[PDB]
């Protein structure tokens, strides 16, 4: 009989990387080295784009207390590409550092900084005891304690209206059930570790299908075509054979999808050229064999493949098992280990597309087109 | 500086249909010979779009006014213009349109397009005067009368100088889609030749993206800037505005819908349906086709 014994696939012979031609340096010093960090209610926003960012320096600086990363490992930040990076900074006590994580409820979390549940990015926190704390006390950092409702994620509230705790309207005047909109921080060296100043910086990444500008430190190789190669275009990776495609891309488009789950085409970042992506090759491997009664010779069929590719598909490296045995394509694949014969017989081991194999006389496995029966004429 | 306008009068507003008008490319992906169902903020089919005449004519003698009221900005705006002499010249966006809060301005003041994001002090009637025939010879001469003071110019874009030259029925259609999400301002546009139309005709055209801007401000209301073909003290004999209000513009509002876009073999959108329009469109969307059998 014929037995489906395994599956075969052509292995990737090379890996290429293509990244944009930006050669700038991101100003990570300014956000981190800034002498004056913002208040809790106001914070700050500093967009970062069109520069390469070496996140290894910040990870191994060892000057930061926390490096908890959400949705991405800190070690792999170098390899990735983002459209832009948002940097926000403020000053928080030691005990309130926990309230910066998503999906948590706390005074800072509810009234000052709400992070979204589906938040990608990292938070950087380190103590600023010798910078933001004074003997007389740094009261320039404010506290929001009482708000009408919980703030939406990534929302800034600056209004200094005197909120109403009771039924009487404050009308912008303090008094009964009317409190100062923004309390002050007691930053003094006498305070404990949980009350010491901590400078907190949050980095939020945008992993969107758009041109990237904050790609990390990496080198770009050359474009090799018409071979099975690992590719990495603007951060998206995969494997396939890439050729020259004639699809008329619109100037604002980057990818191409026909079945909505496979990117059949892509645009090279450096040279704005469009090249399609196709899977390398795969198929099933079947072994045509007579019984261990008759002999031990076998034949192998690589199902549904062009088999100029078979010798380099996938130590058990028989490849072309018997190169002397004339290989020949059928509609089912090409058969290796069998000899083609013009004579037709009744089928005993079916192969497909009218081709049948048998073991006969000296004796060897042969391949032929099946005969439908003896001819007759009434 | 800003100067006032004299004669106002009134005329009740008009409306028009918008059958298959105002479709843009949602994402940046290439599709071929496949119909694909998306979900975004589109202008619903057969919508009621307010109609404004650029020159608010009381009578064809020459009694005029500008019709540029401040309008809301609800989750985006579809804007179309039908004109033949470039009367429309830009828009102003913001919340209060004064010095209290920031406001975006996109004005094509003849020489070059100027995008700014500053705390302008807008007057009640912003307009750009054109002394097309005021001087002895016949040549366009512009005027900038939008705001009074500008501060905190966070963003600024200017274009390379260009001059409009004409040297009267070749009207032009210019569709625009404005959208403001996650602190980004989006502009889509298209241009289409047309001739001798009283209002916007039916048909289909897909609006391609033109720019994505990191303005990141609050937008709730907006206005329109129009070219004043006259002066304000004493323009001339009569018929100050061009052709007594033939220039006009329409405003529609985007809503969360679900369309079934149809891409042809060249990757351009050719037709679409609105799923929540009528039962037949519901059947087409559920069946994922443009034709339904019995």
């Amino acid at each position, epitope marked *: 009989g014929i037995y489906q014994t395994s599956n075969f696939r052509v292995q990737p012979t090379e890996s290429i990387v293509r990244f944009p031609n930006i050669t700038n340096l991101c100003p990570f010093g300014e956000v981190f080295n800034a002498t004056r960090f913002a208040s809790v209610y106001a914070w700050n926003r500093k967009r970062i784009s069109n520069c390469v960012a070496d996140y290894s320096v910040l990870y191994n600086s060892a000057s930061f207390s926390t490096f908890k990363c959400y949705g991405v490992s800190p070690t792999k930040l170098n390899d990735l590409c983002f459209t832009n990076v948002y940097a926000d900074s403020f000053v928080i006590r030691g005990d309130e550092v926990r309230q910066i994580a998503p999906g948590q409820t706390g005074k800072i979390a509810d009234y000052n900084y709400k992070l979204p549940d589906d938040f990608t990015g990292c938070v950087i926190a380190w103590n600023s005891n010798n910078l933001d704390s004074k003997v007389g006390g740094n009261y320039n950092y404010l506290y929001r304690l009482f708000r009408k409702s919980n703030l939406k994620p990534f929302e800034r509230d600056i209004s200094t209206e005197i909120y109403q705790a009771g039924s009487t309207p404050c009308n912008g005047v303090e008094g009964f059930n009317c409190y100062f909109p923004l309390q002050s921080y007691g930053f003094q060296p006498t305070n404990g570790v949980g009350y010491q100043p901590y400078r907190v910086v949050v980095l939020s990444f945008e992993l969107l299908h758009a041109p990237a500008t904050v790609c990390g430190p990496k080198k770009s190789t050359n474009l090799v075509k018409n071979k099975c190669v690992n590719f990495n275009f603007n951060g998206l990776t995969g494997t396939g054979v890439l050729t020259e495609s004639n699809k008329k891309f619109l100037p604002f488009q980057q990818f191409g999808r026909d079945i909505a789950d496979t990117t059949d085409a892509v645009r090279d970042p450096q040279t704005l050229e469009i090249l399609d992506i196709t899977p390398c090759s795969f198929g099933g491997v079947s072994v045509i064999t007579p019984g261990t009664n008759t002999s031990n010779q076998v034949a192998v069929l690589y199902q549904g493949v062009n088999c100029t590719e078979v010798p380099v598909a996938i130590t058990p490296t028989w490849r072309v098992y018997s190169t002397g045995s004339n290989v020949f394509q059928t509609r089912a694949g090409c058969l290796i280990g069998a000899e083609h014969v013009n004579n037709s017989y009744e089928c005993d081991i079916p192969i497909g597309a009218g081709i049948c194999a048998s073991y006969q006389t000296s004796q060897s496995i042969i391949a032929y087109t099946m005969s439908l029966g003896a001819e007759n004429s009434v | 500086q800003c100067v006032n306008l004299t004669t106002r009068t009134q005329l009740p507003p008009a409306y028009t249909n918008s059958f298959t008008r105002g479709v843009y490319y949602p994402d940046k992906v290439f599709r071929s010979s496949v119909l694909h169902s998306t979900q975004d903020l589109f202008l619903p089919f057969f919508s009621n779009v307010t109609w404004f005449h650029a020159i608010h004519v009381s009578g064809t003698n020459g009694t005029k006014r500008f019709d540029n009221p401040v309008l809301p900005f609800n989750d985006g705006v579809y804007f179309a213009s039908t004109e033949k002499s470039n009367i429309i010249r830009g828009w102003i966006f913001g919340t209060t349109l004064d010095s209290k809060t920031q406001s975006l301005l996109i004005v094509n003041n003849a020489t*070059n*397009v100027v995008i700014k994001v500053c705390e302008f002090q807008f007057c009640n009637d912003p307009f750009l005067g054109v002394y097309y025939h005021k001087n002895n010879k016949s040549w366009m001469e512009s005027e900038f009368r939008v705001y009074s003071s500008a501060n905190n110019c966070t963003f600024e874009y200017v274009s390379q100088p260009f001059l409009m030259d004409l040297e009267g029925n070749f009207k032009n259609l210019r569709e625009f889609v404005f959208k403001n999400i996650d602190g980004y301002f989006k502009i889509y546009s298209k241009h289409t030749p047309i001739n001798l139309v009283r209002d916007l005709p039916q048909g289909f055209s897909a609006l391609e993206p033109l720019v994505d801007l990191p303005i990141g401000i609050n937008i709730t209301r907006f206005q329109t800037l129009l070219a004043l073909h006259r002066s304000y003290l004493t323009p001339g004999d009569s018929s100050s505005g061009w052709t007594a209000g033939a220039a006009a513009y329409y405003v529609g509002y985007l809503q969360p819908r679900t369309f079934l876009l149809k891409y042809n073999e060249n990757g351009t959108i050719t037709d679409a349906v609105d799923c929540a329009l009528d039962p037949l469109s519901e059947t087409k969307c559920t069946l994922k086709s443009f034709t339904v059998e019995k």
Partner: nanobody
Amino acid sequence: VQLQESGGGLVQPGGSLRLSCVASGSVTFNSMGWYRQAPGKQRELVAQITAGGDTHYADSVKGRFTISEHRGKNAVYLEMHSLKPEDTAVYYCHLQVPFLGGGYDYWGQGTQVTVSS
């Protein structure tokens, strides 16, 4: 985002460079010209080509640089010859996409073409 441009190249005086500010797709315009900028001075016109075929040239560019366009390719092409160090600058290509009757040029994406021995 629309269009994008890329390229560049260093060169020794007396050489010739062929840079096309390759368009990211078939686009419509009215005057697709070439500009340049070196640190220390304001940005100047180099040469322009319109849809009709008029080729405007700056005062210091006659007889040395010419611009061509490939409609079947959708790319402008400035043929720059007989380079001198004074030509050193970061080179750009503005686009004349019609916006509100013309404007919103796309010269921001440019190339570096420096002439030095």
